[PDB]
Amino acid sequence: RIFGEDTVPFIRDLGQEAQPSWNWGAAYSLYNYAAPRRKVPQFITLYADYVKPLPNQHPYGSGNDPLEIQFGAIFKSETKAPSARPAPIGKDVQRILIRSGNPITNERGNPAGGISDKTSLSPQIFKLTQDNRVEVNVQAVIRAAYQQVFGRQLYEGQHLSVSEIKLENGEISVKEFVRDLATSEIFRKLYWQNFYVCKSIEYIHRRLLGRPTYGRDETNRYYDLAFKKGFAGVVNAILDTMEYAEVFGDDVVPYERYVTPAGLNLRKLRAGTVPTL
Amino acid sequence: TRLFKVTALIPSYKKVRGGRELQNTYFTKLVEYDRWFAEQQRIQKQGGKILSVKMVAGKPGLNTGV
Amino acid sequence: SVVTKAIVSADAEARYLSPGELDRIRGFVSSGERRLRVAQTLTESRERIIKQAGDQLFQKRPDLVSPGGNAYGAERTASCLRDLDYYLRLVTFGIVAGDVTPIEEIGVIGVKEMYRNLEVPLPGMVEAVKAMKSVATGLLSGDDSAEVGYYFDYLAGALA
Amino acid sequence: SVVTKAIVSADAEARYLSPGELDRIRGFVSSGERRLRVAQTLTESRERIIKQAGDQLFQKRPDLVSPGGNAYGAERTASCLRDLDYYLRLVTFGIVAGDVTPIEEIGVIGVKEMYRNLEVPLPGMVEAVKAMKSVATGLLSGDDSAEVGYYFDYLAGALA
Amino acid sequence: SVVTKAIVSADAEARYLSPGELDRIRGFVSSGERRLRVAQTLTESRERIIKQAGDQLFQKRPDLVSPGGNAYGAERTASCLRDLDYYLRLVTFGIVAGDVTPIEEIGVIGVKEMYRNLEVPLPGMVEAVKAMKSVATGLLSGDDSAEVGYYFDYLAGALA
Amino acid sequence: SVVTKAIVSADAEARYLSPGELDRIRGFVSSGERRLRVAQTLTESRERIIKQAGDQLFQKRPDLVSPGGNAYGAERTASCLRDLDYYLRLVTFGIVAGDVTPIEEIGVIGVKEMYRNLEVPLPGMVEAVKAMKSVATGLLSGDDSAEVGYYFDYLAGALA
Amino acid sequence: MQDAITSVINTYDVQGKYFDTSAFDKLKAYYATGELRVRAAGTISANAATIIKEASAKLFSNQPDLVRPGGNAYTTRRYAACVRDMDYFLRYATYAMLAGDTSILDERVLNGLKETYNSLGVPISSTVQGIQAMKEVTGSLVGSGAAKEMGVYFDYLSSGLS
Amino acid sequence: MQDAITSVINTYDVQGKYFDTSAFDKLKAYYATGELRVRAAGTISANAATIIKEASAKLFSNQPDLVRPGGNAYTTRRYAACVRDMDYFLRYATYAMLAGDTSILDERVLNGLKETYNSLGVPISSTVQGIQAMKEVTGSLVGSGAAKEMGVYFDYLSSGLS
Amino acid sequence: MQDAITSVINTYDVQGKYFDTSAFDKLKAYYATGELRVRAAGTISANAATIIKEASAKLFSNQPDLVRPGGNAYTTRRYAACVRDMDYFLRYATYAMLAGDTSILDERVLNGLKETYNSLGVPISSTVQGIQAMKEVTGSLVGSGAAKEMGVYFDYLSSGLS
Amino acid sequence: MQDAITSVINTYDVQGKYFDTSAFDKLKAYYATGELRVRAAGTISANAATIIKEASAKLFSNQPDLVRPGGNAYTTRRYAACVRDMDYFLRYATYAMLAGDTSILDERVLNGLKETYNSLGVPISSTVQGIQAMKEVTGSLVGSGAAKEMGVYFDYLSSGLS
Ligand SMILES: CCC1=C(C)/C(=C/C2=NC(=C\c3[nH]c(/C=C4\NC(=O)[C@H](C)[C@H]4CC)c(C)c3CCC(=O)O)/C(CCC(=O)O)=C2C)NC1=O
Ligand SMILES: CCC1=C(C)/C(=C/C2=NC(=C\c3[nH]c(/C=C4\NC(=O)[C@H](C)[C@H]4CC)c(C)c3CCC(=O)O)/C(CCC(=O)O)=C2C)NC1=O
Ligand SMILES: CCC1=C(C)/C(=C/C2=NC(=C\c3[nH]c(/C=C4\NC(=O)[C@H](C)[C@H]4CC)c(C)c3CCC(=O)O)/C(CCC(=O)O)=C2C)NC1=O
Ligand SMILES: CCC1=C(C)/C(=C/C2=NC(=C\c3[nH]c(/C=C4\NC(=O)[C@H](C)[C@H]4CC)c(C)c3CCC(=O)O)/C(CCC(=O)O)=C2C)NC1=O
Ligand SMILES: CCC1=C(C)/C(=C/C2=NC(=C\c3[nH]c(/C=C4\NC(=O)[C@H](C)[C@H]4CC)c(C)c3CCC(=O)O)/C(CCC(=O)O)=C2C)NC1=O
Ligand SMILES: CCC1=C(C)/C(=C/C2=NC(=C\c3[nH]c(/C=C4\NC(=O)[C@H](C)[C@H]4CC)c(C)c3CCC(=O)O)/C(CCC(=O)O)=C2C)NC1=O
Ligand SMILES: CCC1=C(C)/C(=C/C2=NC(=C\c3[nH]c(/C=C4\NC(=O)[C@H](C)[C@H]4CC)c(C)c3CCC(=O)O)/C(CCC(=O)O)=C2C)NC1=O
Ligand SMILES: CCC1=C(C)/C(=C/C2=NC(=C\c3[nH]c(/C=C4\NC(=O)[C@H](C)[C@H]4CC)c(C)c3CCC(=O)O)/C(CCC(=O)O)=C2C)NC1=O
Ligand SMILES: CCC1=C(C)/C(=C/C2=NC(=C\c3[nH]c(/C=C4\NC(=O)[C@H](C)[C@H]4CC)c(C)c3CCC(=O)O)/C(CCC(=O)O)=C2C)NC1=O
């Protein structure tokens, strides 16, 4: 009907004929010479998403979710391979997070689950009780703080030696040591200055509170804190939240408390760790 | 006005916990001036009693250098 | 397991296992033979232990199997004894593992909410676990009795 | 000042000053004579700059002096010109320091809430500092006028 | 560089560059031409500089080229001189950049890890850096010599 | 010591010592005399172990005692042997204590900063302690040799 | 989260128009059903534990393999997580009924729930069956009209999962 | 796509180098295993429908929720889609085993598949369990070495879906 | 991030090559443009509030639907969000202009902005219009020579959004 | 994480069965090799730096372009990152060897490692070659009985990256 036997096909974009509205953005992504550069299908996904609830996704898109690895801050890029799924996630949408520990200690059902007794499902907890004024626990706590804040130990030139000394000497608490690490120039270099602002906010939130953000209330609050006060403002505000105070006081290093289903899938779905039928 | 020396007593009113926490209740620590308003507020939230506060590093009433 | 806990402690600190941790693993693997013997003895006697503990409990707490009781009837009594068998198997798992971790994962985390949803009394469970400990420790040797009773008392405290 | 900023930045990582910070300090001390002559020129002509700045504000913003405004009245106009005096003194402080830290922590930190507590419009403040910049740069020499102007622009951006 | 460092130091607190930072960038862009001239004079004459620096290093520390030493043998000595060429290229990069930044990322982060994985003695590296500094300052005039000496001093202190 | 390790683990987990680490304490106190006899067997052989280890180290690393090296000269070689004396005494302390705790608390914490202050190469230290391990294991039977080698190679890894 | 009143307020703010007769009519209808909603919510709150008990008993009787070894609810941990999820569904259905709007379900319950359960391994169909059993239990306690009201939210959850 | 020989060719071509002893050794290894690969591919092609039958039976017997109402595989169309996905997994595992490289697996299966299942609501864990079922069923028919070789690519698919 | 100096340094570092005549030519070009860049940066810092003022007013005058009810910029919250985004755009364009490189724009702004705006429902055509508003507003204030320099960074932002 | 003992415990718990003869045989097989595992772990811990030395030297001798300009390991920073990654692989292979299970490799190392390396531009083949080099260097130190044990976990990591 459109082309017949003797006519070469052409792109039937705007002005040539009536344009559908339900596939507008995807279609005009397709009528682009960069369409082969995208390998993820976009129309089956779109037409499936029209008929299903919101996904488990960062409110600013799937490219805002870092891989839940030990260290690195790896994000999807819009440009190397588009693979971008936008979702109409509202401001009151609360993300569904999975506990790294006892399932019924989730804050959604148990508001006191943060102060609940630790099971063997939970990670190792590092607390500094040494005289708070020869001890290997202090060095263990220091290493755990580096492993949580940065995901890994730093090189010798990069250590916050003065803060460490204040830590075994008792002038500062574990919370102040974590603050000195997270506000350090090395942390700013590694996780702030090379990333999209909300990507940095999400990653830093995961390193400091041990959980992804719940939605646009938290992300918008820390986004405005970025706007007003910068990296130090964001980091100090995250550490100054009450939630930090109930889960990590002055004595305990932060630990991972929540994961996303994608981060759980990274570990559980590997061929070794899949539950055998 | 740089560093405060604060000693306080923070009893526990929400739980009874069996680890060692003598260091958490009574403690003397150094708090920054910019941190001290929030620290004092947080201590008062928890029902703690503030015993003494002293200026340590900086000099009181400095129009500059703070 | 002892090995799992040592590895997890070393990994949390991003370090290799220390001589003390390797010493703990060495002692654990040395004792593995007698712990397997204890677990196998406890396994071969499952029917006798479960039966004797069930009769001891029901005679000690008749209200559970009386009409209006939680375990009244053949099917509910069978479910009672089947929970007892679950916990006996979990104790054997703890015996082989070297610690109470299998017990905790499989039957201690969330136990109170589950039995609260089942209307199952917790004092009844505690006394049933105590009866199981008495029967099992009575059947097996005195030296192994302390090792087995450690896990049994852990379970009794957990359900209490 | 520049030395204070370099020292605190170096001590943040507990390290000696980089050749970059040493070079910025060297450039700062190298240009001390010109900036101190600028301080001379500004402090000698305080009343003139303040008066023309107030006149330029009032002609650019007749709103403030008209009845019902923040600056209506002789006393409130006096407070206006007094604040202009404060701010040009702070500009001289920043020029001699080489950094805006004295301006920051004397007249910038908390200025928003402060002129909120005084019902003082911040657009009025930016118009005031722009008038001050124009009057001062008119008097200063070509090279010195730019240096004064950058501090005045910092102050303008700081207020609003 | 100076521009990069100023921009990141501005961005971390979410502000525009202060007058001091802009003045620093002005000084840097005003000194750019002599910086390029210094980069020239170091660049053309570097076969010389490497040879004299290596000879002086192996004279003052014969142990490195004695049997059992790290740089013993023609090939390991060649790797030594190759490292010296690396670091002098980094020095010219720093001179053009106006900061020790390119030096810092390219050859200071993890350098202790790398020279431990190779068991290159860090005191030998520091001695080689002083040798290169002396040779290079020999070929520059006083104004250029001081500037190149700052970067060499940073490198030597960083390896120390 | 082993007792200290068990007590601190118990205190961190905030409960009494379990039968497992109680058995650990019983086994440690049961083996004390063997640890003491091993400590002697190392103690009479101070000079032979230390001098053989130094000879092997300077066989592998002639550069160390070559002119310009760290141990060049009679006095500096004496300081080498005295450091080996310290570490052999620390190994004896560790064998007696049952774990490596005295070894780190006296000679491993801060050793890198110390030897960097002393221009002492860490590879030389690890080669020396490996030589001491090889010498000291020969003096003992296999059962004693294995446990002593555990302390020695822990020390070697810590120095590396 | 938006109720019927908030929905009217937003649909009039988007237009920029003030309230007119139709908005007052919709608000009046919501206040007309408000007493029924409050009584149903109070009854459900009074008997939440009971409802969970018969609903879980019915689900595990109909599908015994769930609580047997190899089932997703075979552990004290996983059984507790299961009854916790059932409590979630009941409580948020009560919220949605009390608000008169299914927004809270999409907003706090159904978002990313399929991905979460699929990553956990939770059977979706059995969760829907638990929701339907909970519906049947809740209806008898709340009465005919309140059951018809709660049914739309239970069916909303079941269709969102399936 | 890319196979083992093409892999070595590309690695040496990017460097601009001629083939040396290591490259020739890799080529010789592939040529040694070629006959085993061909036998395994023929056996699988003969028995593909069978392997799919036992794998699907295992998966839907251990997880019957998938095929009851409300499940992802509940309809004739969705059941057929599931078995078609398993058929494609098997065919591309055979292709990868013949080629000796997992490049075709990436390009023709794993690029965009996890996003597609995330949109569709497909439980990826159950898909991986079905892939593991196909692995064990295939190994018995193909023998020991062919089973190890096929399991390499089955595990590659399973970890790629992760 | 990366500026012109660092760009040349990295190119020659990856080549392992030495600064040749071309490198010194590029360095001379940047040093020649530096004083203009610094003057423009200071001017834009002085008038940033004014630039946002005028650009917002003009954008909302050309497209008044944004600020009327039902518009993306209609609320105090959404209007303040628009102003905050424009203030970022101005500040980061100034950073890129002073650096002489657009790497900072890429990594800090454009990597993830399209998906954020598409998920938020933010119109991207109108955002590009606002960027062009800031462009020709700041062009008057900085002067023609500095306008020609800042315009390329504003167009880079616009092309990244479009 | 999951070790051999916990693997057997879980595989029997999911069945609901007590330990039979096969279970006790598996437990005996694990306990018999405990001394070998502990001795090998001690040797590897004491010689980790030497192993990293020799593996890195071998890898950068076979592929010297990695540490030369234009190579992924060309800088002090990136060379440090390379040797750090190698140290991580050695540490986790030792953990997996003590455990008797490859689970910790899947849930602390290989989870997203391939995609992370693809994102970073890290050459996967060269990293696999470095892991192999660590395998030969460790096999000499630990001895044949422990070399075979370390080989399976090194091959597991290599197949995870590959
Ligand atoms: C079946 C569902 C469907 C819808 C709804 C739809 C809307 C639609 N409206 C369009 C154009 C348009 N639509 C409008 C209408 C607006 N102008 C304003 O003044 C008014 C508020 C309003 C009219 C009441 C206008 C003016 C255009 C022309 C835009 C242009 O070309 O500049 C276009 C692009 C031209 C084309 O059709 O090929 C679409 C796709 N398309 C669909 O497939
Ligand atoms: C491991 C070392 C350690 C010790 C020793 C210790 C003692 C201790 N007891 C406390 C409270 C308390 N302690 C007591 C006990 C007293 N009541 C009287 O009847 C008795 C004479 C006496 C006990 C025999 C009471 C009643 C409180 C509650 C505070 C109050 O209301 O007065 C508190 C502070 C509040 C809290 O529990 O968090 C501490 C720190 N804490 C430690 O970490
Ligand atoms: C491996 C961890 C695990 C445990 C422990 C477990 C217990 C458990 N016991 C149950 C039933 C039951 N359990 C009991 C046992 C009670 N009767 C008396 O009161 C005693 C106090 C007590 C036993 C000593 C009874 C009577 C029932 C029947 C409840 C009913 O059908 O109404 C049920 C409900 C599902 C079913 O009947 O199969 C569970 C889940 N399930 C698990 O997955
Ligand atoms: C019990 C804990 C402890 C240790 C270990 C320790 C080591 C130590 N070694 C020192 C010197 C030294 N140590 C050495 C030995 C090194 N030279 C190299 O060739 C060898 C690889 C290596 C020995 C195996 C040498 C040569 C010196 C002299 C360096 C100098 O004075 O410049 C010194 C300075 C005091 C002196 O000169 O006598 C200390 C404190 N001190 C302690 O309190
Ligand atoms: C209010 C919105 C919301 C929902 C719905 C929700 C469900 C939910 N259920 C979970 C676990 C679970 N959920 C279940 C329930 C299943 N067991 C049986 O198969 C049943 C068919 C079925 C329930 C009727 C089980 C067994 C787990 C444990 C999974 C595991 O530990 O592996 C988890 C992960 C652990 C955690 O709680 O953090 C979530 C997030 N979470 C939320 O924030
Ligand atoms: C529903 C929430 C909402 C509000 C309230 C709102 C206010 C609002 N006030 C505006 C301008 C204005 N607003 C005022 C009112 C002020 N003049 C005097 O100083 C008084 C103190 C004060 C009024 C009592 C004036 C005079 C303007 C015009 C300024 C201009 O055109 O530049 C504009 C810009 C209109 C445009 O760009 O087309 C908005 C959007 N916007 C919203 O989305
Ligand atoms: C530094 C890099 C960066 C940028 C730029 C950025 C943009 C950004 N803009 C946002 C909101 C917004 N942004 C705008 C601005 C647009 N709408 C108007 O019509 C204009 C055409 C246009 C601006 C000129 C608006 C109106 C919102 C509010 C959206 C909403 O609340 O739903 C939000 C989400 C705030 C929230 O959680 O509600 C982000 C993250 N984020 C970043 O990390
Ligand atoms: C631009 C940043 C950068 C640097 C600096 C760098 C250095 C570097 N030096 C190396 C080897 C070496 N480096 C040296 C130098 C030492 N010889 C003496 O001990 C002296 C104290 C000292 C030189 C003054 C030697 C001898 C080797 C050879 C070691 C061997 O034979 O294995 C290697 C191993 C691979 C190779 O030789 O190409 C690297 C990567 N790599 C980089 O990407
Ligand atoms: C514990 C689990 C885990 C691993 C293993 C991991 C790998 C990892 N390696 C990285 C960098 C790197 N990794 C390597 C190593 C590779 N490139 C060389 O050519 C070699 C062939 C090869 C090693 C044998 C290099 C060179 C870099 C620097 C790349 C860069 O920083 O851009 C990074 C970037 C973050 C950072 O450097 O701080 C990660 C996340 N991340 C994890 O969470």
PDB file of all heavy atoms in Angstrom, chain G residues 142-157:
ATOM      1  N   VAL G 142     -15.421  -7.743  57.534  1.00  0.00           N
ATOM      2  CA  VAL G 142     -15.828  -6.359  57.300  1.00  0.00           C
ATOM      3  C   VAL G 142     -17.257  -6.219  56.796  1.00  0.00           C
ATOM      4  O   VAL G 142     -17.788  -5.098  56.784  1.00  0.00           O
ATOM      5  CB  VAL G 142     -14.888  -5.642  56.310  1.00  0.00           C
ATOM      6  CG1 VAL G 142     -13.482  -5.568  56.870  1.00  0.00           C
ATOM      7  CG2 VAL G 142     -14.914  -6.320  54.962  1.00  0.00           C
ATOM      8  N   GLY G 143     -17.906  -7.305  56.390  1.00  0.00           N
ATOM      9  CA  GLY G 143     -19.266  -7.223  55.901  1.00  0.00           C
ATOM     10  C   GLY G 143     -19.318  -7.023  54.399  1.00  0.00           C
ATOM     11  O   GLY G 143     -18.307  -6.833  53.729  1.00  0.00           O
ATOM     12  N   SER G 144     -20.539  -7.058  53.861  1.00  0.00           N
ATOM     13  CA  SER G 144     -20.708  -7.123  52.410  1.00  0.00           C
ATOM     14  C   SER G 144     -20.193  -5.868  51.710  1.00  0.00           C
ATOM     15  O   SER G 144     -19.391  -5.958  50.772  1.00  0.00           O
ATOM     16  CB  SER G 144     -22.179  -7.355  52.069  1.00  0.00           C
ATOM     17  OG  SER G 144     -22.376  -7.391  50.667  1.00  0.00           O
ATOM     18  N   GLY G 145     -20.649  -4.689  52.140  1.00  0.00           N
ATOM     19  CA  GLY G 145     -20.252  -3.465  51.459  1.00  0.00           C
ATOM     20  C   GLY G 145     -18.777  -3.155  51.615  1.00  0.00           C
ATOM     21  O   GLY G 145     -18.095  -2.803  50.647  1.00  0.00           O
ATOM     22  N   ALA G 146     -18.260  -3.286  52.838  1.00  0.00           N
ATOM     23  CA  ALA G 146     -16.841  -3.041  53.064  1.00  0.00           C
ATOM     24  C   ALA G 146     -15.986  -4.075  52.344  1.00  0.00           C
ATOM     25  O   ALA G 146     -14.866  -3.772  51.919  1.00  0.00           O
ATOM     26  CB  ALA G 146     -16.544  -3.031  54.560  1.00  0.00           C
ATOM     27  N   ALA G 147     -16.499  -5.297  52.179  1.00  0.00           N
ATOM     28  CA  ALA G 147     -15.791  -6.299  51.398  1.00  0.00           C
ATOM     29  C   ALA G 147     -15.744  -5.915  49.930  1.00  0.00           C
ATOM     30  O   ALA G 147     -14.708  -6.062  49.278  1.00  0.00           O
ATOM     31  CB  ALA G 147     -16.459  -7.662  51.567  1.00  0.00           C
ATOM     32  N   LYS G 148     -16.862  -5.431  49.390  1.00  0.00           N
ATOM     33  CA  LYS G 148     -16.865  -4.973  48.005  1.00  0.00           C
ATOM     34  C   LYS G 148     -15.894  -3.814  47.820  1.00  0.00           C
ATOM     35  O   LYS G 148     -15.250  -3.686  46.773  1.00  0.00           O
ATOM     36  CB  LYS G 148     -18.278  -4.575  47.583  1.00  0.00           C
ATOM     37  CG  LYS G 148     -18.383  -4.140  46.131  1.00  0.00           C
ATOM     38  CD  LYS G 148     -19.819  -3.863  45.728  1.00  0.00           C
ATOM     39  CE  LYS G 148     -19.893  -3.287  44.325  1.00  0.00           C
ATOM     40  NZ  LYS G 148     -19.449  -4.266  43.296  1.00  0.00           N
ATOM     41  N   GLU G 149     -15.773  -2.961  48.837  1.00  0.00           N
ATOM     42  CA  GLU G 149     -14.819  -1.858  48.760  1.00  0.00           C
ATOM     43  C   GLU G 149     -13.375  -2.354  48.805  1.00  0.00           C
ATOM     44  O   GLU G 149     -12.547  -1.934  47.988  1.00  0.00           O
ATOM     45  CB  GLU G 149     -15.082  -0.862  49.888  1.00  0.00           C
ATOM     46  CG  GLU G 149     -14.131   0.327  49.913  1.00  0.00           C
ATOM     47  CD  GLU G 149     -14.231   1.207  48.678  1.00  0.00           C
ATOM     48  OE1 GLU G 149     -15.226   1.098  47.931  1.00  0.00           O
ATOM     49  OE2 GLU G 149     -13.305   2.015  48.455  1.00  0.00           O
ATOM     50  N   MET G 150     -13.051  -3.236  49.753  1.00  0.00           N
ATOM     51  CA  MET G 150     -11.678  -3.721  49.894  1.00  0.00           C
ATOM     52  C   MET G 150     -11.283  -4.620  48.729  1.00  0.00           C
ATOM     53  O   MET G 150     -10.088  -4.807  48.448  1.00  0.00           O
ATOM     54  CB  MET G 150     -11.528  -4.474  51.214  1.00  0.00           C
ATOM     55  CG  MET G 150     -11.373  -3.590  52.432  1.00  0.00           C
ATOM     56  SD  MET G 150      -9.783  -2.753  52.475  1.00  0.00           S
ATOM     57  CE  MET G 150      -8.677  -4.120  52.767  1.00  0.00           C
ATOM     58  N   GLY G 151     -12.273  -5.201  48.054  1.00  0.00           N
ATOM     59  CA  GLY G 151     -11.985  -6.120  46.975  1.00  0.00           C
ATOM     60  C   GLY G 151     -11.318  -5.448  45.796  1.00  0.00           C
ATOM     61  O   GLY G 151     -10.501  -6.059  45.111  1.00  0.00           O
ATOM     62  N   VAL G 152     -11.660  -4.185  45.536  1.00  0.00           N
ATOM     63  CA  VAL G 152     -11.050  -3.498  44.403  1.00  0.00           C
ATOM     64  C   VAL G 152      -9.560  -3.299  44.646  1.00  0.00           C
ATOM     65  O   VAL G 152      -8.747  -3.445  43.732  1.00  0.00           O
ATOM     66  CB  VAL G 152     -11.782  -2.171  44.104  1.00  0.00           C
ATOM     67  CG1 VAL G 152     -13.280  -2.405  44.024  1.00  0.00           C
ATOM     68  CG2 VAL G 152     -11.466  -1.104  45.135  1.00  0.00           C
ATOM     69  N   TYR G 153      -9.170  -3.036  45.894  1.00  0.00           N
ATOM     70  CA  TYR G 153      -7.754  -2.849  46.198  1.00  0.00           C
ATOM     71  C   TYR G 153      -7.011  -4.178  46.236  1.00  0.00           C
ATOM     72  O   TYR G 153      -5.869  -4.272  45.764  1.00  0.00           O
ATOM     73  CB  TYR G 153      -7.610  -2.094  47.514  1.00  0.00           C
ATOM     74  CG  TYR G 153      -8.407  -0.818  47.521  1.00  0.00           C
ATOM     75  CD1 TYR G 153      -9.610  -0.736  48.200  1.00  0.00           C
ATOM     76  CD2 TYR G 153      -7.978   0.294  46.812  1.00  0.00           C
ATOM     77  CE1 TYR G 153     -10.353   0.423  48.189  1.00  0.00           C
ATOM     78  CE2 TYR G 153      -8.711   1.459  46.801  1.00  0.00           C
ATOM     79  CZ  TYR G 153      -9.898   1.519  47.491  1.00  0.00           C
ATOM     80  OH  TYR G 153     -10.635   2.678  47.482  1.00  0.00           O
ATOM     81  N   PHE G 154      -7.639  -5.223  46.779  1.00  0.00           N
ATOM     82  CA  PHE G 154      -7.003  -6.537  46.730  1.00  0.00           C
ATOM     83  C   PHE G 154      -6.830  -7.016  45.292  1.00  0.00           C
ATOM     84  O   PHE G 154      -5.772  -7.544  44.930  1.00  0.00           O
ATOM     85  CB  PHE G 154      -7.809  -7.546  47.542  1.00  0.00           C
ATOM     86  CG  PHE G 154      -7.579  -7.453  49.019  1.00  0.00           C
ATOM     87  CD1 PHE G 154      -8.635  -7.265  49.888  1.00  0.00           C
ATOM     88  CD2 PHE G 154      -6.305  -7.559  49.540  1.00  0.00           C
ATOM     89  CE1 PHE G 154      -8.424  -7.183  51.239  1.00  0.00           C
ATOM     90  CE2 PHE G 154      -6.091  -7.476  50.894  1.00  0.00           C
ATOM     91  CZ  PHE G 154      -7.152  -7.290  51.743  1.00  0.00           C
ATOM     92  N   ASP G 155      -7.853  -6.824  44.458  1.00  0.00           N
ATOM     93  CA  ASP G 155      -7.754  -7.184  43.051  1.00  0.00           C
ATOM     94  C   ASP G 155      -6.730  -6.319  42.337  1.00  0.00           C
ATOM     95  O   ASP G 155      -6.053  -6.782  41.415  1.00  0.00           O
ATOM     96  CB  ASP G 155      -9.122  -7.057  42.385  1.00  0.00           C
ATOM     97  CG  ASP G 155     -10.071  -8.164  42.790  1.00  0.00           C
ATOM     98  OD1 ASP G 155      -9.709  -8.964  43.676  1.00  0.00           O
ATOM     99  OD2 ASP G 155     -11.180  -8.236  42.220  1.00  0.00           O
ATOM    100  N   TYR G 156      -6.607  -5.055  42.743  1.00  0.00           N
ATOM    101  CA  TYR G 156      -5.576  -4.197  42.182  1.00  0.00           C
ATOM    102  C   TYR G 156      -4.192  -4.752  42.465  1.00  0.00           C
ATOM    103  O   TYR G 156      -3.344  -4.811  41.570  1.00  0.00           O
ATOM    104  CB  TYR G 156      -5.706  -2.788  42.752  1.00  0.00           C
ATOM    105  CG  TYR G 156      -4.926  -1.771  41.971  1.00  0.00           C
ATOM    106  CD1 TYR G 156      -5.405  -1.289  40.766  1.00  0.00           C
ATOM    107  CD2 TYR G 156      -3.698  -1.319  42.417  1.00  0.00           C
ATOM    108  CE1 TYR G 156      -4.697  -0.371  40.041  1.00  0.00           C
ATOM    109  CE2 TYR G 156      -2.982  -0.404  41.698  1.00  0.00           C
ATOM    110  CZ  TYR G 156      -3.485   0.070  40.508  1.00  0.00           C
ATOM    111  OH  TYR G 156      -2.782   0.989  39.775  1.00  0.00           O
ATOM    112  N   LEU G 157      -3.946  -5.169  43.707  1.00  0.00           N
ATOM    113  CA  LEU G 157      -2.653  -5.763  44.038  1.00  0.00           C
ATOM    114  C   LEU G 157      -2.420  -7.050  43.259  1.00  0.00           C
ATOM    115  O   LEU G 157      -1.322  -7.279  42.734  1.00  0.00           O
ATOM    116  CB  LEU G 157      -2.563  -6.026  45.538  1.00  0.00           C
ATOM    117  CG  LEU G 157      -2.483  -4.788  46.422  1.00  0.00           C
ATOM    118  CD1 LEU G 157      -2.603  -5.172  47.881  1.00  0.00           C
ATOM    119  CD2 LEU G 157      -1.186  -4.058  46.161  1.00  0.00           C
TER     120      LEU G 157
END
